[PDB]
Amino acid sequence: MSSLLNSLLPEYFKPKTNLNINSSRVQYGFNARIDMQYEDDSGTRKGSRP
Amino acid sequence: MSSLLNSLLPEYFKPKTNLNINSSRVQYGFNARIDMQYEDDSGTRKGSRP
Amino acid sequence: GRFLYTDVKYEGQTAFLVDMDTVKARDHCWVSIVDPNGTMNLSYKMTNFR
């Protein structure tokens, strides 16, 4: 059931036709950007994981 | 006069009960973030001290 | 990290001869320029105290 399992993939990702698998192990993920903001009794601190 | 000298501390800083002093010298300060913006006759330049 | 006028170490009136050729680069952000031209404008903001 193609239309069922095709819906599970995320909206941003649309994969191409071919895939040359040449191993018994494949990592899959995404490269996201995190913008953290910290606050406590001592004070405030702002950072960013690129 | 606790209430008088307690008011002098900055609004962001609230210190904890104990402090194990183990020397005859203590530095105290804060870690701030500076967002500078420069403009002259040659042109404009924007930076940031993290 | 600031400059007070008392670092001159001379009460009274004087005129200063600034050496513009021997301007060393100790700490450089992207804002940092060596050759100023005309009317210099610097606008900074301090946030995230801890």
From Swiss-Prot, chains A, B:
Subcellular localization, as worded in the UniProt entry = Virion
Coiled-coil region: none
Superkingdom, taxonomy of origin:
Viruses
Q: Which family does it belong to?
A: Belongs to the totivirus major capsid protein family.
Q: What does this protein do?
A: Capsid protein self-assembles to form an icosahedral capsid with a T=2 symmetry, about 40 nm in diameter, and consisting of 60 capsid proteins asymmetric dimers. The capsid encapsulates the genomic dsRNA and the polymerase and remains intact following cell entry to protect the dsRNA from degradation and to prevent unfavorable antiviral responses in the host cell during all the replication cycle of the virus. Nascent transcripts are transcribed within the structural confines of the virion and are extruded into the cytoplasm.
Q: What is this protein called?
A: Major capsid protein
Which source organism does the UniProt entry give? Saccharomyces cerevisiae virus L-BC (ScV-L-BC)
**Source species taxonomy:** Viruses, Riboviria, Orthornavirae, Duplornaviricota, Chrymotiviricetes
Gene coding for it: gag
Swiss-Prot record, chain C:
Q: Look up and give the organism this protein is from.
A: Saccharomyces cerevisiae virus L-BC
Q: Please, which domain of life does this record's source organism belong to?
A: Viruses
Mind telling me what this protein is named? Major capsid protein
Instruction: Give the family this protein belongs to, as stated in its UniProt record.
Output: Belongs to the totivirus major capsid protein family.
Name its cellular compartments: Virion
Its job: Capsid protein self-assembles to form an icosahedral capsid with a T=2 symmetry, about 40 nm in diameter, and consisting of 60 capsid proteins asymmetric dimers. The capsid encapsulates the genomic dsRNA and the polymerase and remains intact following cell entry to protect the dsRNA from degradation and to prevent unfavorable antiviral responses in the host cell during all the replication cycle of the virus. Nascent transcripts are transcribed within the structural confines of the virion and are extruded into the cytoplasm.
